[PDB]
Design an enzyme around this catalytic site. Structure first.
Site, PDB file in Angstrom:
ATOM      1  N   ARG A 118       5.616 -14.202   8.211  1.00 33.89           N
ATOM      2  CA  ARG A 118       5.966 -12.790   8.341  1.00 33.89           C
ATOM      3  C   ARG A 118       7.304 -12.661   9.054  1.00 33.89           C
ATOM      4  NH1 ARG A 118       0.417  -9.826   8.460  1.00 33.89           N
ATOM      5  NH2 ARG A 118       0.960  -8.349   6.765  1.00 33.89           N
ATOM      6  N   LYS A 140       3.720   1.526  11.873  1.00 34.17           N
ATOM      7  CA  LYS A 140       3.924   2.823  11.236  1.00 34.17           C
ATOM      8  C   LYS A 140       3.701   3.955  12.232  1.00 34.17           C
ATOM      9  N   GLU A 159       0.834  -1.196   0.000  1.00 31.14           N
ATOM     10  CA  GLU A 159       0.000   0.000   0.000  1.00 31.14           C
ATOM     11  C   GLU A 159       0.869   1.246   0.000  1.00 31.14           C
ATOM     12  OE1 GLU A 159      -2.580   0.138   3.294  1.00 31.14           O
ATOM     13  OE2 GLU A 159      -3.079  -2.029   3.247  1.00 31.14           O
TER      14      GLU A 159
HETATM   15  N1  LIG Z   1       6.549  -8.060   8.308  1.00 31.17           N
HETATM   16  C1  LIG Z   1       6.339  -8.552   7.113  1.00 31.17           C
HETATM   17  N2  LIG Z   1       7.023  -9.583   6.744  1.00 31.17           N
HETATM   18  C2  LIG Z   1       6.874 -10.104   5.566  1.00 31.17           C
HETATM   19  N3  LIG Z   1       6.003  -9.669   4.702  1.00 31.17           N
HETATM   20  C3  LIG Z   1       5.236  -8.646   4.944  1.00 31.17           C
HETATM   21  C4  LIG Z   1       5.368  -8.025   6.202  1.00 31.17           C
HETATM   22  N4  LIG Z   1       4.532  -7.062   6.212  1.00 31.17           N
HETATM   23  C5  LIG Z   1       3.936  -7.071   5.050  1.00 31.17           C
HETATM   24  N5  LIG Z   1       4.347  -8.018   4.293  1.00 31.17           N
HETATM   25  C6  LIG Z   1       3.847  -8.270   2.978  1.00 31.17           C
HETATM   26  O1  LIG Z   1       4.048  -7.075   2.353  1.00 31.17           O
HETATM   27  C7  LIG Z   1       3.135  -6.885   1.334  1.00 31.17           C
HETATM   28  C8  LIG Z   1       2.597  -5.495   1.366  1.00 31.17           C
HETATM   29  O2  LIG Z   1       2.248  -5.137   2.659  1.00 31.17           O
HETATM   30  P1  LIG Z   1       1.307  -3.978   3.012  1.00 31.17           P
HETATM   31  O3  LIG Z   1       0.147  -4.059   2.226  1.00 31.17           O
HETATM   32  O4  LIG Z   1       1.979  -2.743   3.159  1.00 31.17           O
HETATM   33  O5  LIG Z   1       0.597  -4.563   4.230  1.00 31.17           O
HETATM   34  P2  LIG Z   1       0.676  -4.217   5.741  1.00 31.17           P
HETATM   35  O6  LIG Z   1      -0.543  -3.453   5.992  1.00 31.17           O
HETATM   36  O7  LIG Z   1       0.573  -5.565   6.331  1.00 31.17           O
HETATM   37  O8  LIG Z   1       1.900  -3.457   5.999  1.00 31.17           O
HETATM   38  C9  LIG Z   1       2.059  -7.830   1.634  1.00 31.17           C
HETATM   39  O9  LIG Z   1       2.238  -8.902   0.755  1.00 31.17           O
HETATM   40  C10 LIG Z   1       2.373  -8.255   2.996  1.00 31.17           C
HETATM   41  O10 LIG Z   1       1.760  -9.483   3.248  1.00 31.17           O
END
Ligand SMILES: Nc1ncnc2c1ncn2[C@@H]1O[C@H](COP(=O)(O)OP(=O)(O)O)[C@@H](O)[C@H]1O
Ligand SMILES: [Cl-]
Ligand SMILES: [Cl-]
Ligand SMILES: [Cl-]
Ligand SMILES: [Cl-]
Ligand SMILES: [Cl-]
Length: 481
Positions: free
Chosen positions: A224, A234, A16
């Site tokens: 994760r 954030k 996002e």
């Molecule tokens: N801590 C993390 N470790 C690994 N992958 C992640 C992590 N956080 C987010 N992702 C993957 O990053 C991609 C984008 O994340 P994002 O949409 O910004 O989601 P979030 O709201 O969880 O931050 C998604 O595929 C998410 O599943």
């Protein structure tokens, strides 16, 4: 990767644009790349603005470029809103979706106890005209959300009438849960990678896909990535920034990709650490980074600016002799730096205090010398007098006392931001976790350019962050695990 076929794999990275990427993002982005490359596939980059700036899209494209990832196309979830609208209406006409005005609390544990909401039996045409209220923004519309008609009594809470459209260009917007499978399908994704924290969701994902008779998308889940003594929320990070605990999102103490690369991490080490492994310890990531950078970086010399002790070779003159030597002895194609020396040297005081009245020692890359006497004014050591003997297990590093040529450097050493491993949480911060120390370094170090990695002998590993006016260098220390 279920039912994967070489040349017919499409994955995507769907972040996002609501913040800067951090390390866990890097795992996701990398695994999408790795599975796409494994099957000679394609990787899409999707900016997921379903529930919405551009500074973040810019920051994302630069972080991905920095990780060395390349994408076939760039899309926005936004680009399919009209189509999602269409599908919404379709589900309403299949009696698979309905408008609801039950309240959020009520709805929440009507779901919890599995009683069908009042509107679950609404006629089709009431559901449609309510959806129109939503698309126009009326006070009726805002009181209404569209949700799928699945099973309020399923053992899976994600299967209990999840919300598809909410009223908030567009007056109504789709939820993540609804937009994800539809967009993944119509964009051609074959394998959608998702964090297994969202694991009850899969049956719902597939539900949507089959209920619209769309082309199935396989889901590949992964763990994760979270680290000890680290925050990646954030809100907590913006809190750090707003109180001037750091003064940029690029601070070397930040788990952002920007901050972590500034701190010295190499993309190679991060990718290897992802492949070759409840939270994780930075120690193994930095140990991999050490093993990777150690044989391809030059070695330079530095001594403390203030505690340095003067060593005199009585038997030489003050004529400076120059000798080309190799930057890294082991890999002899790394190049040659220049070595300047004469009768007067600087060494460390922690080393000066260790020398006895007649020891023989070795100045690295130069030769052995014979300590003659240890002149100690006051209580401290003021000076050391020795003898050339260039033609021992006390091999020390040194600088030529040539002040108009020695380069002045500030060493930034950093500690973890927070004290615990994972509402009054700010009491667990380390504010004094940015240590500065001033050194002189070797003249030949003026060769370096910003971003370069090197090693200070018997000190540690460093990256050149900025260059101040008057060739003052700022060196960030790379942890070594
Ligand atoms: N801590 C993390 N470790 C690994 N992958 C992640 C992590 N956080 C987010 N992702 C993957 O990053 C991609 C984008 O994340 P994002 O949409 O910004 O989601 P979030 O709201 O969880 O931050 C998604 O595929 C998410 O599943
Ligand atoms: Cl995993
Ligand atoms: Cl957190
Ligand atoms: Cl800064
Ligand atoms: Cl991992
Ligand atoms: Cl610490």
């Amino acid at each position: 990767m279920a039912n994967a076929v070489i040349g017919n794999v499409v994955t995507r990275f769907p972040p996002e644009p609501s913040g800067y990427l951090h390390v866990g993002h890097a795992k996701a982005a990398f695994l999408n790349n790795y599975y796409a490359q494994m099957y000679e596939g394609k990787m899409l980059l999707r900016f997921d603005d379903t529930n919405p700036d551009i500074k973040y899209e810019k920051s994302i494209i630069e972080d991905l470029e920095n990780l060395g990832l390349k994408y076939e196309k760039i899309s926005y979830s936004s680009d399919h809103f009209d189509l999602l609208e269409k599908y919404c209406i379709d589900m309403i006409k299949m009696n698979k979706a309905y408008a609801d005005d039950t309240g959020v609390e009520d709805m929440r544990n009507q779901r919890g106890e599995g009683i069908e909401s009042i509107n679950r039996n609404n006629s089709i045409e009431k559901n449609l005209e309510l959806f129109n209220e939503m698309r126009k923004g009326t006070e009726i519309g805002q009181k209404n959300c569209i949700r799928a008609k699945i099973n309020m009594q399923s053992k899976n809470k994600c299967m209990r009438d999840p919300v598809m459209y909410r009223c908030i260009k567009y007056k109504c917007y789709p939820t993540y849960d609804f937009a994800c499978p539809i967009i993944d399908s119509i964009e051609g994704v074959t394998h959608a990678l998702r964090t297994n924290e969202y694991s009850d969701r899969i049956e719902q994902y597939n539900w949507f896909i089959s209920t619209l008779n769309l082309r199935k998308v396989y889901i590949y889940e992964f763990s994760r990535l979270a680290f000890v003594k680290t925050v990646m929320s954030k809100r907590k990070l913006k809190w750090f920034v707003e109180n001037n605990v750091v003064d940029s999102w690029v601070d070397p103490r930040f788990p952002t990709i920007k901050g972590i690369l500034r701190r010295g991490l190499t993309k190679e080490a991060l990718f290897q650490f992802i492949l070759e492994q409840n939270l994780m310890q930075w120690d193994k990531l930095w140990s991999i980074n050490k093993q990777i950078i150690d044989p391809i970086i030059p070695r330079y010399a530095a001594v403390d600016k203030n505690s340095s002790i003067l060593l005199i070779l009585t038997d030489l003159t003050d004529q400076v002799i120059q000798k080309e030597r190799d930057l890294h002895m082991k890999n002899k194609s790394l190049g040659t730096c220049n070595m300047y020396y004469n009768n007067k040297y600087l060494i460390e005081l922690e080393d000066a205090q260790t020398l006895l009245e007649n020891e023989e020692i070795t100045l690295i890359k130069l030769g052995n010398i014979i300590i003659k006497n240890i002149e100690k004014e006051n209580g401290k050591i003021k000076q050391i007098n020795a003898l050339s003997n260039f033609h021992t297990k006390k091999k020390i590093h040194w600088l030529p006392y040539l002040p108009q040529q020695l380069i002045t450097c500030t060493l930034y050493e950093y500690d973890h931001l927070i004290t615990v491993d994972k509402d009054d949480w700010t009491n667990f911060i380390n504010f004094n976790s940015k240590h500065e120390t001033l050194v002189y370094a070797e003249p030949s170090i003026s060769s370096l350019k910003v971003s370069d990695k090197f090693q200070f002998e018997r000190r540690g590993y460093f990256i050149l962050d900025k260059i101040d006016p008057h060739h003052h260098l700022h060196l960030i220390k790379i942890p070594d695990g």
